[PDB]
């Protein structure tokens, strides 16, 4: 499939530290199916997000519905079935950090994957079970859709 | 993959300016039209002076520069005349230039205003705008009793890209998105900014709600004419010249694809 | 002393041509059009019209130096298309646009003067 | 020394407006109202008439070189 992570999040807070940028807003969200915290920077100018909103988030390694790697190059004249069709807000970034509560002897029970979508930062942290798909320096997509 | 179908709506037409709106075109086309208004609409202007006598208090280059900036009526003649580059004659001929004479002498005590009315042309169609049959005549020089200015000018075809004296416009107001819906400007304090004359907003509202899917359409123009051409003639010449540049570029492009 | 004549910006020198086409070996199906004695007036419209073509993958232009009087237009198209063909179609579309705009402006003047 | 022909900024002709401007000023217009009467909208052309110093009038106080 090419999907590293999928879950349904609920916007719990927007810009707790205050509005830092005009067209970008930081959402602090928490899901229900996996109990994962999310910090996410979103362009609220084109995709406004209100407090209490509920959305489906899908971290994916590729947009093509069939397992097929991406070249990282912009190809607008691409006609294959892309899963971005199923979603409203799509971002493309790279994982730049994976933290965890591991010790010198114990493995990590909770992981924290950090992604950068061209400077819009995301932190998806929770059980390490759900963040096996993330390596550092690996390109991923956001695939976020609002639902009622 | 194909051309726009722009529409036009002229909201004001006087002898002094034309205020119009082009709608359903790209911002690049609108700005290129604006630029051609200023820089690639040919007119006639004095570009050659011979001072036979100048006892005035302004030196010869001052008089010459001042004559070059006098607008000359260029309406029907500019399309007919050739550039002296293209003319197969000597320095001058009636097919590429227009003769002017000026010959003034202050005899009385009391100051003689050498104005554009003293520029006498050989061509009745190309005359100083102020001299055309209100607004006074452009002042070339003031002469004291005993002072004298006699000169012979030639006016030629050119556009504002070579010298601002061949610029037919006296200001090209250009606007789009009067209510800042595309947010191409970002007002720190939108309430402090006055409304555009083309704004369509109630006074409580400072700018339109942001349009994520918009682009610039409906460009507003106010082309003011210096006098050489009519404003509608400026706009029609601009469209012809821009087009016709594109045609020349196409011809050279075809040759260059051919030759490969 | 060092002032170029004002005609240099728009007149062409002998033996130097208006437009030159050069592959871009960077990527496939890309070309550089070096156009002499033109400026932003044509570069901007050609670039925007090219951006209207869905078979154009890249369309950009630059004036490499304001004191020099040439523009570079880089056009990359899809493999089934050609940058030369894209450039030709962009110029044709701009010409048709300007012809239509001219005719409609004539009509709008016509109406304004008589009512 | 003499009124410029064109506005430096836009290129509007101001060389035929100096004499009318002075005539309006002696007619007890304010400078702004006089500039409004001559059709100088833009503060560039208003700058051209409002900031002009007619030095030629002083240069004409000297007798010419030839009688
Ligand atoms: Zn000739
Ligand atoms: Zn002005």
Phi and psi at C71, nearest 5°, equal -125, 150
CB B69 within 8 A of CB B163: no
Task: Identify the three-state secondary structure at position A124.
Answer: strand
The Cα B127–Cα B120 span in angstroms is 8
- Can you read off the two tokens belonging to residue B220? 């507003």
Q: How far is CA B59 from CA B51, B56, B90, D16, D40, in A?
A: 10, 7, 29, 21, 29
Secondary structure (H, E, C), B154-167:
EEEEECCCCCHHHC
- Name the nearest CA neighbour of C87 among C112, C55, C64: C55
- Ligand 1 is an ion; its neighbours by CB within 5 Å are B 87, 89, 93, 95-96
Q: How far apart are CA B240 and CA A79, in angstroms?
A: 40
> Token pair for residue D1?
């020394």
What are the domain boundaries of chain C? 1-115
Q: Which helix (H) or strand (E) holds D50?
A: helix D43-50
- Distance, in Å, from the CA atom of A19 to the CA atom of A26, rounded to the nearest integer, reads 8
Name the closest residue on chain B to residue A45, using Cα atoms: B212
| Residue corresponding to tokens 């999928």 | A6
Task: Work out the number of other CB atoms within 10 angstroms of the CB of residue B157.
Answer: 25
CB within 8 Å of D51: residues ≥ 6 apart = none
A22–B212: do the CB atoms touch at under 8 Å?
Answer: no
Task: Burial-class residue D6 by CB neighbours within 10 Å (0-12, 13-18, 19+).
Answer: buried
Nearest 5 degrees, angle CA B233-CA B239-CA B245? 125
All domains of chain B in start order, with CATH: 1-42+165-260 (3.30.1360.10), 43-164 (2.170.120.12)
State this model's resolution in angstroms. 2.6
Give the span between the Cα atoms of B201 and B198, in whole angstroms.
10
CB contact under 8 A, D13 and B169: no
Token pair belonging to B138: 């452009």
Kindly state the tokens that stand for B1. Answer: 């993959």
Closest CA to B220 of B186, B171, B178, B184: B178
Distances (CA, A) of A28 to A38, A139, B6, D14: 6, 22, 47, 63
- Chain D contact probe: residue of B170, B197, B225 with most D CBs at under 10 A: B170
Distance CA B96, CA A23 (A): 58
CA B84, B90, B96, B100 dihedral sign is positive
SS3 labels along chain B: CCCCCCEEEEEEECCCEEEEEEECCCHHHHHHHHHHHHHCCCEEEEEEEEEEEECCCCCHHHHHHHHHCCCECCCCCCCCCCCCCCCCCCCCCCCCEEEEEEEEECCCCCCEEEEHHHCEECCCCCCECCCCCCCCCCEEEEECCCCEEEEEEEEEEECCCCCHHHCCEEEEEEEECCCCCCCCCCCCCHHHCCCCCCCCCCCCCCCCCCCCCCCCCCEEEEEEECCCCCHHHHHHHHHHHHHHHHHHHHHHHHHHHHCC
B218 by Cβ neighbours in 10 Å (0-12 / 13-18 / 19+) ranks as middle
CA A46 to chain CA centroid, Å, is 17
Distance of CA B221 to the CA centre of its chain: 14
Provide the 8-state DSSP code for C72: E
- Would you tell me how many other CB atoms lie within 10 Å of the CB of residue A19? 11
Buried b (16+ CB within 10 A) or exposed e, B71-99: bbbbeebbeebeebeebeeeeeeeebbbb
User: Which are the contacts of A98, defined by CB distance < 8 A and separation ≥ 6?
Assistant: A111, A112, A113, A114, A131, A134, A135, A136
Chain D contact set for B136 (CB, 8 A) = 16-17, 19-20
Contact C78 A76 (CB under 8 A): no
**CA-based end-to-end distance of chain A:** 26
DSSP state of C12: P
Contact A22 B210 (CB under 8 A): no
* B16 known ligand binder: no
* CA distances to A42, B210, B216 from B188, in Å: 21, 15, 22
Cβ within 8 Å of residue C38, ≥6 positions away: B245, B249, C69, C70, C71
In angstroms, the CA B130 to CA B133 distance is: 8
CB contact burial A25-43 (16+ within 10 A = b; e otherwise): bbbbbbbeebebbbbbbbb
Q: How far, in whole angstroms, is CA B240 from its chain's centroid?
A: 15
Q: Which CATH class is domain C1-115?
A: alpha beta
∠ CA C26-C27-C33 to the nearest 5 degrees? Answer: 75
Residue B226, marked binder: no
CB pairs under 8 A between B and D: 79
Mutation target to probe the B interface, by most B beta carbons within 10 A, among D10, D18, D37, D54 is D10
Distance CA B91, CA B197 (A): 49
User: Minimal CA–CA distance to A6: which of A62, A56, A40?
Assistant: A56
The chains in contact with chain D, meaning 3 or more Cβ pairs closer than 8 Å, are B
Ligand 2 centroid–CA A107 distance in Å is: 75
- Comparing alpha-carbon positions, the chain A residue that sits nearest to B183 is A45
Query: CB contact, 8 Å: B257 with chain A?
Result: no
Q: Which residue has the tokens 């030639």?
A: B154
Flag if A45 and B186 touch (Cβ within 8 Å).
no
Name residue A145's beta-bridge partners: A56
Q: What are phi and psi of B215, to 5 degrees?
A: -135, 175
Lookup result for tokens 């590729």: A62
Task: Return left, alpha or beta for B151; rule: phi > 0 is left, psi -120 to 50 is alpha, else beta.
Answer: beta
Close Cβ partners of B231 (under 8 Å, ≥ 6 residues apart): B13, B14, B16, B17, B18, B223, B224, B225
CATH superfamily name and code, D1-67: Homeodomain-like (1.10.10.60)
Return the structure tokens found at A74: 């912009």
Q: Which residues contact C102 (CB under 8 A, 6 or more apart)?
A: B236, B239, B240, B243
Q: Which helix (H) or strand (E) holds A70?
A: none
CB B186 to CB A22 under 8 A?
yes
Contact by Cβ (8 Å): B182, B216: yes
Residue C79 sits at the chain A interface (C-beta within 8 Å): no
Quick one: angle between helices B231-258 and C83-114, nearest 10? Answer: 160
Chain D residues touching residue B226 (CB < 8 angstroms): 6, 11-13
Instruction: Find out whether B153 and B102 touch, Cβ atoms under 8 Å.
Output: yes
Strand extents, DSSP E, chain A = 3-14, 24-31, 37-43, 54-60, 92-100, 110-117, 120-127, 139-141, 144-147
User: Which class for A72: exposed (0-12), middle (13-18), buried (19 or more C-beta within 10 A)?
Assistant: exposed
The secondary structure element, H or E, covering residue C32 is strand C30-36
Q: How far is CA B12 from the centre of its chain?
A: 18
Q: Residues B85, B89, B95, B98: is their CA dihedral positive or negative?
A: positive
SS3 C83: helix
From chain A, pick out residues whose CB is under 8 angstroms from the CB of C78. 77
Say how far residue B243 (Cα) sits from the centre of its chain: 18
What is the residue whose two structure tokens read 């030759």?
A: B259
Which residues are bridge partners to B20 per DSSP? B10, B221
Residue whose C-alpha is closest to residue D13's, from D48, D37, D43: D48
User: Quick check: B212 and A45 CB within 8 A?
Assistant: yes
Rounded to the nearest angstrom, the gap between the alpha carbon of residue C22 and the centroid of all alpha carbons in its chain is: 15
DSSP D13: B
Other Cβ atoms less than 10 A from the Cβ of A148: the count is: 4
The secondary structure element, H or E, covering residue C36 is: strand C30-36
Please check whether residue B187 touches A, CB under 8 A: no
Cα dihedral B226, B229, B231, B234 in deg (nearest 10): -110
Locate C93 and state its tokens: 């579309």
CATH-assigned architecture of domain A5-148: Beta Barrel (2.40)
End-to-end CA distance of chain D: 23
d(CA D29, CA B120): 35
Element (H, E) at C27: none
Q: Are B40 and B94 in contact, with CB atoms under 8 Å apart?
A: no
Question: Which of B58, B116, B171 minimises the CB distance to D1?
Answer: B58
Answer whether A103 touches C (CB < 8 Å). Answer: no
The reply to whether D10 sits in an annotated binding site is yes
Element (H, E) at D63: none
- The tokens of B26 are what? 């790209």
On chain D, the residues whose CB falls within 8 A of the CB of B108 are none
> Is D45 marked as a binding-site residue?
yes
Which residue is listed with tokens 């990527």?
A: C27
D19: burial class by Cβ within 10 Å (0-12, 13-18, 19+)? Answer: middle
Whole-number Cα distances in Å, B29 to A63, B4, B43: 36, 10, 22
Short-list B130, B139, B104, B119, CA closest to D2: B139
Q: Say whether C57 sits in a helix, a strand or coil.
A: strand
Give me the residue spans of the domains in chain D: 1-67
Q: Which two tokens stand for residue A16?
A: 């707790």
Tell me the torsion sign for CA atoms A36, A37, A39, A40.
Answer: positive
């Amino acid at each position: 499939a090419g999907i590293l992570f999928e879950d349904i999040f609920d916007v719990k807070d927007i810009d707790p530290e205050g509005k830092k940028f005009d067209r970008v807003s930081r959402l602090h969200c928490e899901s229900e199916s996996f109990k994962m915290d999310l910090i996410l920077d979103v362009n609220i100018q084109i995709y406004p997000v209100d407090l209490g909103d509920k959305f489906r988030l899908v971290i994916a390694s590729t947009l093509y519905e069939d397992g097929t790697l991406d070249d990282g190059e912009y190809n607008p004249t691409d006609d294959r079935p892309s899963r971005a069709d199923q979603f409203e807000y799509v971002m493309y970034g790279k994982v730049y950090r994976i933290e965890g509560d591991e010790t010198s002897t114990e493995a990590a029970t909770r992981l924290s994957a950090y992604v950068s979508y061209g400077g819009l930062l995301m932190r998806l942290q929770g059980d390490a079970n759900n963040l096996h798909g993330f390596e550092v320096d690996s390109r991923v997509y956001l695939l976020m859709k609002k639902l009622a | 993959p194909y051309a726009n179908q722009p529409t036009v709506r002229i909201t004001e037409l006087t002898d002094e300016n034309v205020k119009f709106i082009i709608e359903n075109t790209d911002l690049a086309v609108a700005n290129s039209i604006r630029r051609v208004f200023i820089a690639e609409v040919p007119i006639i202007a004095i570009d050659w002076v011979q001072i036979d006598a100048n006892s005035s208090v302004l030196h010869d280059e001052f008089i010459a520069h001042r004559l070059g900036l006098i607008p000359l009526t260029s309406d029907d003649i500019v399309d007919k005349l050739q550039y002296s580059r293209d003319c197969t004659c000597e320095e001058f001929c009636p097919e590429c230039s227009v003769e002017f004479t000026l010959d003034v002498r202050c005899n009385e005590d009391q100051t003689r205003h050498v104005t554009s009315r003293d520029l006498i042309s050989n061509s009745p169609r190309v005359i100083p705008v102020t001299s055309r049959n209100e607004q006074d005549d452009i002042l070339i020089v003031k002469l004291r009793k005993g002072q004298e200015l006699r000169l012979r000018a030639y006016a030629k075809k050119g556009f504002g890209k070579e010298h601002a004296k061949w610029n037919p416009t006296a200001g090209v107001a250009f606007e789009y998105d009067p209510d800042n819906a595309l947010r191409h400007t970002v007002y720190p304090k939108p309430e402090e900014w006055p409304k555009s004359e083309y704004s369509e907003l109630d006074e409580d509202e400072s700018q339109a709600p942001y349009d994520p899917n918009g682009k610039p359409e409906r460009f507003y123009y106010n082309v003011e004419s210096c006098g050489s051409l009519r404003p509608e003639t400026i706009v029609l010449s601009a469209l012809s010249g821009l087009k016709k540049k594109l045609s020349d570029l196409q011809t050279q492009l075809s040759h260059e694809i051919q030759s490969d | 002393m060092n002032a170029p004549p004002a005609f240099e910006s728009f007149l062409l020198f002998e033996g130097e041509k208006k437009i030159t086409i050069n592959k871009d070996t960077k990527v496939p199906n890309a070309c550089l059009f070096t156009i002499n004695k033109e400026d932003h007036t044509l570069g901007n419209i050609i670039k925007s019209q090219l951006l209207k073509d869905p078979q154009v993958l890249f369309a950009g232009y630059k004036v490499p130096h304001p004191l020099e009087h040439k523009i570079i237009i880089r056009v990359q198209t899809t493999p089934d298309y050609s940058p030369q063909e894209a450039f030709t179609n962009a110029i044709t579309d701009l010409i048709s646009e300007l012809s239509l705009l001219e005719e409609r402006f004539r009509v709008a003047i016509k109406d304004k003067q008589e009512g | 020394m003499i009124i410029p022909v064109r506005c430096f900024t836009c290129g509007k002709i101001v060389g035929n407006k100096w004499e009318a401007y002075l005539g309006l000023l002696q007619a007890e217009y304010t400078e702004g109202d006089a500039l409004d009467a001559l059709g100088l909208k833009r503060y560039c052309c208003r700058r051209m008439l409002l900031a002009h110093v007619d030095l030629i009038e002083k240069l004409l106080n000297y007798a010419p070189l030839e009688k």
